[PDB]
């Protein structure tokens, strides 16, 4: 099957950001989580980071951060002080009410030397 | 910098194709080549496969084939008897006349066993 | 899950056509079948009507016909002398080579009286 | 004649929602109603549910709910405890000032078992 | 009710053209006619000018001409030796098979002196 | 030369509205006026009705009213107690700072009996 | 007043091309000419170069050539042996039958050292 | 390489604004500067004028002004009493965190005589 994904090509030494925007976001209905390699399953249990529709509900992490305006659907992932092992495919799962309405948006991180 | 790429998720044992289309194609002006991991450098010289404006000019490779119609801009890469080592990023470079007009189109291949 | 479909509103007894177009069609690789209520499963068995990429390979219906240019991807369904039992949802399944590449297109037929 | 409609494919046992959005909505000018199979006539009486510019003013049953933010034009229909008989075509009628300006928006609900 | 129309602002003294293009045109199914003030009724009888799928079938007119390529759907109206009385609203009726599939496209002509 | 316009087809006996929306409107920079047959000249002098960017500043005639939200760019014209002589072409002129930046928006009104 | 134009940033030493496409082109009705700084006046006389709707009708020039397929509306301008003085705004005037129907398309050429 | 730019045509002696809008602007992340003929380099340390994401941080110029709301991304340039030497190409550089994410936006100013 053929799908599409975003590619972020970056340099080591500063935090990097993986874009995920869901413009129609509403704090009343939506929530979100990030996973590596694969999308977290429905109900966002086993994720890198997670939100409720307003803010991060995940325990505070040294690595993972959401620095965008979450109530407007800017759930972009910030990865602090990245290393080469952080390279690879990430999945942003937007939770949508109802049956099989979730949106999965993929971002590939490619870290290289300046 | 952020770009985008096509993802092809496929199964082993049959030929797979990585889509690459250049609608504006004209045989007198355009040319093309394919590369793995990275785009070949300007002048498409050490690539997986290469064409002029009409046809494949590099050898006759058992693994790599272009089965689409090149003069109409269908330069999709076909890979015969693919194995797991064939997974990864491929790059399709459309050569366009002039200064920095070349088009680079990326496709990530993911092969599963099923 | 949320999708979309075309609705064809016609009068009982008049031949009707349910639109289904696949612009990218190739006589070498594509095929198709139509189903009522649900799309036929892959391999288009037990269908209203079916093709190979050139022509209808199904026997012949007094009712069902493909009158468009099948090798150019116009696999629109024509229904002769439709009756009230012919109202309802139809599904046009385009068979595409590879893993989960098939396209499903829905058309709802609504027949009226006078 | 050919029109288009959205299809909502859902599972039994939980409330389902049928989208109907009118962005230009104003509590001063607009009102709305929902009907089954056919759109309610002008003046939105004999309906499943109906509003003024702000809120629901009458419903045929507690089964039907408008839970979106209505003054912003989200008059999407929620159906509580849906059963198989709830499947079929629904029509959302937006009332607009002037002569023949009403908007009719159709949604087909498909409830599945298993 | 609100619709839209094209406006042609022109000068007297040379033939003028009112655009009407129907890209989907096919000589096997489509035909057309022009009317002044209103589109002619279905079946395009007592019209300014009329065609079948290929060509003008109404008597040759000293005033009205179709100079575009009709089999490709260019059924734009040419008006020879225009005078001020030629100003006003025109309607281009595309005849399409089936129930209420005809398309009406309106053009208002405003002719000026010199 | 070819342009386009909105057509409002309405009935006598009730107020009618002619649409003119300018979304980028700002009370600090924009103003507007309506004219019959032609847009009023630059400076909107002797128009049907005119505003200063916030509200109508001249010629709320009797007939002519602006009931939309002017600061949000809804400068749609309401004509109270319309008669047949009110049919015809109207022009909405949006005044914009700088050289020849004004926008002209045309609406043709067609009034029918009742 | 605010309009738009395409920008061609190129390098010296090879012929350069300024795009101008009119998809709707038909040889019976359309014709075309190019001008520098400003559009040539109606009646494409004179331009750097001009056509009749099929092919170039102006004298054959050493500097200016139209290498696209003109009957399909590819009236892009090719400039042979460009120098810095060739930089600036160019205007492609597509002639269309009737009153004030002509299309003007602007391209700015920027040549670098 | 081929890009596009906005053209502003104004009359000498009148203040002009050169549009530059960046919708995604955030006071936390973005900064900007304007240059003539060419974009200022990364880090905007010469330029015509510059901001820190909230306001102009370059010392006040008699010529150059940013009068739009900078925190919403309107970094349009206002030039007071422009003279003939002010004609020409301008470049608006939006600075974005990470590697090669800066956006370059061009405006050509054309000043005409009174």
Swiss-Prot record, chains A, B, C, D, E, F, H:
Compartmental location: Cell membrane; Secreted, Extracellular exosome
All copies of domain Ig-like V-type, residue ranges: 5-106
Name this polypeptide is given: T-cell immunoglobulin and mucin domain-containing protein 4
Organism name: Homo sapiens (Human)
Stretch of the intact protein here: 22 to 134 of 378
Stated family: Belongs to the immunoglobulin superfamily. TIM family.
Disulfide bonds: 20-92, 33-44, 39-91
Gene, per the UniProt record: TIMD4
Function: Phosphatidylserine receptor that plays different role in immune response including phagocytosis of apoptotic cells and T-cell regulation. Controls T-cell activation in a bimodal fashion, decreasing the activation of naive T-cells by inducing cell cycle arrest, while increasing proliferation of activated T-cells by activating AKT1 and ERK1/2 phosphorylations and subsequent signaling pathways. Also plays a role in efferocytosis which is the process by which apoptotic cells are removed by phagocytic cells. (Microbial infection) Plays a positive role in exosome-mediated trafficking of HIV-1 virus and its entry into immune cells.
Assembly and oligomerization: Interacts with MERTK; this interaction enhances TIMD4-mediated efferocytosis. Interacts with EPHA2.
Domain notes per entry: Recognizes phosphatidyl serine via its immunoglobulin domain.
């Amino acid at each position: 099957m053929v799908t599409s994904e975003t590619v972020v090509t970056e340099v080591l030494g500063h935090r990097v950001t993986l874009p995920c925007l869901y413009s129609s976001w509403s704090h009343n209905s939506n929530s979100m989580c990030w996973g590596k390699d694969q999308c977290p399953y429905s109900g966002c249990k086993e994720a890198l980071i997670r939100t409720d529709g307003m803010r991060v509900t995940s325990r505070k992490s040294a690595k993972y951060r959401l620095q965008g305006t979450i109530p407007r659907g800017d759930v972009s992932l910030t990865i602090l002080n990245p290393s080469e092992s952080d390279s690879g495919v990430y999945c942003c799962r937007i939770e949508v009410p109802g049956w099989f309405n979730d949106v999965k948006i993929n971002v590939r991180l490619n870290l290289q030397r300046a």
